[PDB]
Write a protein that binds this ligand. Structure first.
Ligand SMILES: NCCC[C@H](N)CC(=O)NCCC[C@H](N)CC(=O)NCCC[C@H](N)CC(=O)N[C@@H]1[C@H](O)[C@@H](OC(N)=O)[C@@H](CO)O[C@H]1NC1=N[C@@H]2C(=O)NC[C@@H](O)[C@H]2N1
Ligand SMILES: NCCC[C@H](N)CC(=O)NCCC[C@H](N)CC(=O)NCCC[C@H](N)CC(=O)N[C@@H]1[C@H](O)[C@@H](OC(N)=O)[C@@H](CO)O[C@H]1NC1=N[C@@H]2C(=O)NC[C@@H](O)[C@H]2N1
Ligand SMILES: NCCC[C@H](N)CC(=O)NCCC[C@H](N)CC(=O)NCCC[C@H](N)CC(=O)N[C@@H]1[C@H](O)[C@@H](OC(N)=O)[C@@H](CO)O[C@H]1NC1=N[C@@H]2C(=O)NC[C@@H](O)[C@H]2N1
Lengths: 150, 117
RNA sequence: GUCAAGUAAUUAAGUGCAUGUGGUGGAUGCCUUGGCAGUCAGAGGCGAUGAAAGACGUGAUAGCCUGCGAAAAGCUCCGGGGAGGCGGCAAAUAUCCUUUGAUCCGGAGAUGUCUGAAUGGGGGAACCCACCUACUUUAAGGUAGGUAUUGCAACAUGAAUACAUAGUGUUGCAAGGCGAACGAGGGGAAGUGAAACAUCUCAGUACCCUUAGGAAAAGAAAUCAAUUGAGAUUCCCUCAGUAGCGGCGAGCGAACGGGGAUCAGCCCAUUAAGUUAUGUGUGUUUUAGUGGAACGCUCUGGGAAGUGCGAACGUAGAGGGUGAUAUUCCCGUACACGAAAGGGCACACAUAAUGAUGACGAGUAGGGCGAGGCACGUGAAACCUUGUCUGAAUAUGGGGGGACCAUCCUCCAAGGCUAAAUACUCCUGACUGACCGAUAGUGAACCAGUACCGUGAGGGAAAGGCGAAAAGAACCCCUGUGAGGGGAGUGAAAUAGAUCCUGAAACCGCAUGCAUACAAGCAGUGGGAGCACCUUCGUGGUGUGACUGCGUACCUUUUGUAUAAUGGGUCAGCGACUUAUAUUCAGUAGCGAGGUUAACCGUAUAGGGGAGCCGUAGAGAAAUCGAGUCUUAAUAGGGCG
RNA sequence: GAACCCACUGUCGUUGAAAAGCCAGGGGAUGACUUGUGGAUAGGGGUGAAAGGCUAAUCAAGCCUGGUGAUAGCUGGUUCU
RNA sequence: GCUAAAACUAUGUGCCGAAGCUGCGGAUGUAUACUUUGUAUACGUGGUAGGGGAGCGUUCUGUAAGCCGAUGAAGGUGUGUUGAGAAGCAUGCUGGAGGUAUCAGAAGUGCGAAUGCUGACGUGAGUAACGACAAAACGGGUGAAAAACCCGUUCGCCGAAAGACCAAGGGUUCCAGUCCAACGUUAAUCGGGGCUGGGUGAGUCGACCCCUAAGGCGAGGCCGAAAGGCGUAGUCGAUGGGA
RNA sequence: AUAGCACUCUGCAAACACGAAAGUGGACGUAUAGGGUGUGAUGCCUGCCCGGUGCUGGAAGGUUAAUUGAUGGGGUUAGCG
RNA sequence: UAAGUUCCGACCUGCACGAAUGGCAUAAUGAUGGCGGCGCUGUCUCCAGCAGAGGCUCAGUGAAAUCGAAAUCGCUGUGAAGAUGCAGUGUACCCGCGGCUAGACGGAAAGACCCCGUGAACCUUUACUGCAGCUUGACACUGAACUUUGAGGUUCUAACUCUGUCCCGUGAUCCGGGACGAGGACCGUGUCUGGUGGGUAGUUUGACUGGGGCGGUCUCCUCCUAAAGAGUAA
RNA sequence: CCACAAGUCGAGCAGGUACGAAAGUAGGUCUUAGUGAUCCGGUGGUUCUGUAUGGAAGGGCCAUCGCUCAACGGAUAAAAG
RNA sequence: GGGAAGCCUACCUCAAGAUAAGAUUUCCCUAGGACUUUAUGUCCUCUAAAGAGCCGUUCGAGACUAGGACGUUGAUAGGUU
């Protein structure tokens, strides 16, 4: 805190409580007692623990019937209405789409839709697998995830 | 995550001051004095819940003594006579009858002295 | 009817409690043209062509702020844009300007007073006094240019003193000052710890001084290693709190090897890589900008974006605003375009200049004496630097391998240049936050480094909120043509009425109900009559509390406190076991005789990376052995396993 | 013995008219005198007819800013059930 | 207050008396058996320094483009009600735009004390004091109002200063008109207060200028790790000389 | 503090003081001068002690530093066994 | 003096005067210390009256320190041992104003006396340990020629000195260069080295203890205290 | 026996001894005081280590020496008012 | 029975807040309605006594108070004689 270098008044004789600096944390406008610094909040996750958690998540999705498999999922043109109708056909209006590779047209069509996101098979994450209502996965992406074993 | 204390602190102080209603001077206005006054009131109430039983038993005994001496007995002799007569009516009911029904108390005293004889 | 004795009701000067209604005060809640911390990408300087920082002026009105400079809220040109505008506090007013294109935005020019390195001399900064040229005027002036010091170069001149040299002058070129952090170098503490203190520590830290660059420094082995192998610097992870150093105290603390980031070498006189300027060409980037989709009805309401019912766009559902909460009202967003003129960067050629006074390294290596640096405190002390005194050999030569000798291995000092990986943030643009929301966050959200204090260096505040819109209250009344208020009017709201959202507490009034003027103390508590209001008419509710049993605050510190031991006048707000790293134990999860990666790469929480760490074997000081091992002459005995 | 320069005694004042005074008396008053303006000496230093006096109402080591959040086996305080 | 006691000695029969024991209702800890149970039984539940266990509330992140809200959020103020507690829930009035379940996650997470810090406000108390004991009185005027302002008539005080000037220092306090909230230790129509407008005229007065003292700076120079010290030629510097 | 007195140092580039040095004061002075120390007008005066500490002057015996490096004892290996 | 621990003069067993840290005197001088007298008085016996300024009342303005909260009596006792607040008892209707200072261990300043902390500062010295200053010798700057018994003596100039004279830069008591003169291998300086060194600096200077200091003690063995096992303090 | 660091008693086994004819006795003295940790150094020994290798220097291990560290669990090698 | 400057009286002053609030003398007030909370009842109209005070002139009374005297039917104060 700015200033505060000198002793405000003498140690004895004034009848005041003894003070060493005007920026003492007891004083209004003084320093904070335990001043914070920038922190790193990352944790270590064991490789096997991460893989096992992802396997558990995928299995639980399967047995709760939130994973929907499709032979192919593509859009002819980058049209939000096209993607919306395609999803409304499968009854997956709120969904995370997983494909083996992300087509530019599909990504553009999905960008503006609320509750819809499209990711690569190698970019799935545990929070996004749980947050969305349904996960629509192509067979090629499912095979790639099988090879990776979650 | 800075936390401001005002709402909760105000609620606690207000509850203490509400419990201190009716006290004299700073005891119903000033938080420190009022807080000292509420704790002491609780301490007194805890002690007096025990004192009350003794005080009321003493009152019953005094009234029974007056009735017995009206009927020609002392309290101790009347209690002994009732014990020997097997009557197990307690002092609360005995004092109630002594105050409100002289004929019934006279009958009870007669039973006691008959057992004494 | 009189008298007597006994015994009810009736007072409030004032006070207590409860409730109602106010004042003061500015807490709380909600909010923010303010702060705090970062990421990515730039940039890393300004200055004698006069800087940073200032003084004084400049307006139709002109106090402060902002801009500007006697050409003075501006002048010229080029480009954009298309209906308002004459900067803000800060409304009104006038004169006005503008589709013959204003205000405004970008680029380039013109002007640019005085002080300040301040440089014609001086000086108490913003002032005083000058000289010399050229032109101009006739009076007592004007215009433009020049006049500092030091260093270097050329020219000229020139003593003691003969030649010279010193000295002197002119011209040309250059430098000085300021400013964040990082770099390099010259000097260099003490508080503290060691539970005292001197060796030691703190610590080459704080501080003082000199001086660069976008980075700097270092750098191409007279280096390590020890299967004869590696192969210049710099930075990160390990090795490892190991080997060692140490009043062998407190403490200090490597290297070898391995894994990564980045990779690069080139020369000593015919002279290299590289670097810096100027010009040309090409590419890219940057300084204004243009277009940019799609909503209606109904209900509540002061106001619709909110309810109910249907519809449309989406490569646009980022964000902001609009009278409450909007993809479709406005500004925008995705996307598609755009530049007279200027700047930055990258590559290629051209010319300069540098590298580059240096050609294999002598007052050098080594030594005696005293110090300093190495993790290493004189130690068994190698190696580096040198204040002092000395002093080689010079490729059949010389340095190192931690006293020293021999043998082996390895390098060639006394000459140089060199990018990247590394360090930082005064500043510019974009974006972000389990960062703050006016006692917080910068000292400063507000005309703050101000007011104020001090001779001075220096220290250093407080202070945000009417309303959607001023629609900021015409007019009437009391009053001193005051202050203040009551009506009226505006507004959804005026107890939103100007220090105006909300409006707490301490503290201070008025009104009503009950109690209180014969009675002694922490002020309550357990009982309990009466009265007033209400009432489900009661074995009920609210307020009060005659009379009565018991009862000496709280905290701290103590053997022990009502203590006449400490602390607190009261309220509101703030105020004290945290953060990083290492280690041990316990829970819990994964895997399991195995477990696990670090730096780093990675459009990146994934996936790679096995160097390293822990466990799996002990004994011994150690060499050594090993389910054994140490001690011993011992297979005895005994200790650790 | 006036001005001027001092400060021996007493009352008052002591939240003062005043962070050192007023009043009544008192000493020196051509001298080692008093005084204006402008200068010099700077902190383990200065200056001192010497009291550890004075050095900006501060002196057995001035003031300011830094080391610095010095250390304190001591005192105090330490917040809901 | 007590005397064949209400004293002392001995004996007897009753009674009073604690949060001890018993009775009735409720909570909680440990163990045995019921071979989940949440059930019965038995034994426990005063506590400082300490150790262990279990929770309530506050701010922020996700869940949350969800849920509540102008038919009224947060905050403020009452009332009722619920639990063993920290606390929860409902609602009247005020208020005028936000609030947030559940389950996880992170802390600027809880104040009465530290002669704690900042602001506001009490008690003392309408108490002390209103600053030289040179001194005032009356008539008239203006004004809302006159002991204090103006005019007049008296009285008193200073007169080597309590008068008149200059330098230093200050900076508009100078003059006129107008105003009285704040400032003036009272009121004020008055003012060194607010606002508006005026006012400082030099060859001879002073400064500037010429000259130098103490002292300062100092081309070259001497000295010093650096910063710097001293000093020559000079150049400044009045408190002095020059119409 | 003082005039007066005494002791002692100082031959001038003085002793002494300031300073890191350059240099400056002493002093544009020269032993009838300058510094340090004690005493304190004036009158009468100022006794005894050199063992201690200090100062001044001798003596060259004993002890002692850097420097110097005579001797003795080890390490290493050509060679000899 | 009626009465003299003070004063003056004298005496001398001077606890513990004494001759320039001066001895004994001494005119004048001193807001200097002690004693006595005249005059004078409210200093006093012993206070009275009067004058001014406050105090008191009215109008206006308007502080202070303190403060846990107060429905804030006496006495005797009790009790962290000196009570408004506890016990017993006595007295006492409610509230101001002018006075007063016996108590509220009254207010004021985290006691300065005393002790403690392995606190501080400054001062002293024959405390410890450094350093400045001063001084000694060796080596370097540092040379030459003649003598004597490693050292000594005489002479010289060319290193070096001059806060001596003259000349020039130059309008100059600095400085530099030149010429003289006087010195001269001395003096002086650098490195190393012995001595001196409260001038200056950093520090140390124990504990127990019927307060601390002074005294005593501090480790080991035997007996008693020691209460018939062990252990057990001053 | 005991906080630790320390201290005390000890049958018995092996080797080498002394005295006894022998069974046997002897690991100092009737016993309980006669003492000092760690660090740093000196001496003797050593089938340990030895910074490229062979040595060596130095270090380790075994035995032993240097304390009124007596404030006797000993804060420094070195300290009064 | 006697018996002290001592105790209770006796002497002086105060004294019924002596809440047990005492005593005596003298003086003053003798009206109507409505209603229900049917009683020292609550509201209207009428009535305002004996006295006390405010105010004024004042005091041998006094800080302010309180107390004493007087207020035209008058000597309370000033003036006048
Ligand atoms: N039934 C009863 C009837 C009784 C009878 N009728 C009697 C009666 O009725 N008497 C009335 C008396 C009332 C009172 N005495 C009068 C009074 O007070 N006049 C005040 C007159 C001057 C006033 N001071 C000026 C003023 O307001 N400056 C502010 C100020 O610079 C600043 O504000 C704050 N905060 O810093 C600024 C910031 O915005 O804003 C300004 N202002 C702005 N306004 C603007 C706005 O709205 N939008 C746009 C922008 O222009 C805004 N800025
Ligand atoms: C460094 N090593 C040697 C070197 O290369 N340059 C510096 C040489 C300095 C050296 N101390 C000799 C010298 O000349 N000292 C003077 C001296 O201290 C003083 O003058 C007087 N008169 O007292 C001072 C007044 O300002 O000026 C200095 N000189 C200055 N020259 C400077 C200049 O031009 N700019 C900047 C600032 O350094 C100026 N000061
Ligand atoms: C030395 N410092 C000179 C000094 O002081 N002289 C004094 C002086 O002049 C003065 O003395 C005072 N006035 O006090 C005088 C009395 O008239 O006596 C003289 N001294 C005398 N001593 C002498 C003595 O005894 N006899 C003869 C005659 O020579 C006397 N004078």
């Amino acid at each position: 805190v700015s200033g505060g270098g000198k002793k405000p008044f003498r140690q004895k004789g004034t009848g005041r409580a003894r003070a060493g600096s005007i920026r003492s944390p007891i004083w209004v406008g003084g320093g904070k007692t335990f001043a914070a610094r920038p922190q790193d909040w990352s944790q270590k996750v064991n490789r096997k623990m991460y893989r096992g958690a992802m396997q558990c998540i995928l299995a639980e999705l399967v047995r709760q019937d939130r994973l929907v498999l499709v032979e192919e999922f593509a859009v002819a043109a980058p049209k939000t209405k096209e993607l919306l109708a395609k999803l409304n056909d499968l009854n997956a209006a709120r969904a995370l789409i997983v494909t083996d590779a992300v087509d530019e047209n599909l990504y553009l069509a999905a960008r503006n839709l609320p509750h819809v996101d499209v990711v690569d098979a190698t970019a799935i994450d545990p929070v996004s697998l749980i947050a969305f209502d349904k996960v629509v996965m192509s067979v090629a992406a499912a095979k790639k995830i099988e090879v990776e074993l979650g | 995550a800075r936390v401001k204390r005002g709402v909760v602190a105000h609620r606690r102080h207000k509850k203490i001051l509400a419990r201190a209603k009716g006290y004299y001077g700073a005891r119903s206005r000033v938080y420190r004095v009022a807080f000292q006054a509420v704790i002491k009131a609780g301490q007194y109430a805890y002690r007096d819940r025990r004192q009350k039983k003794r005080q009321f038993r003493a009152l019953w005994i005094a009234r029974i003594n007056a009735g017995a001496r009206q009927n020609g007995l002392s309290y101790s002799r009347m209690i002994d006579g009732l014990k020997k007569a097997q009557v197990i009516i307690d002092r609360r009911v005995l004092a109630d009858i002594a105050m409100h029904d002289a004929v019934a108390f006279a009958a009870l005293a007669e039973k006691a002295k008959g057992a004494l004889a």
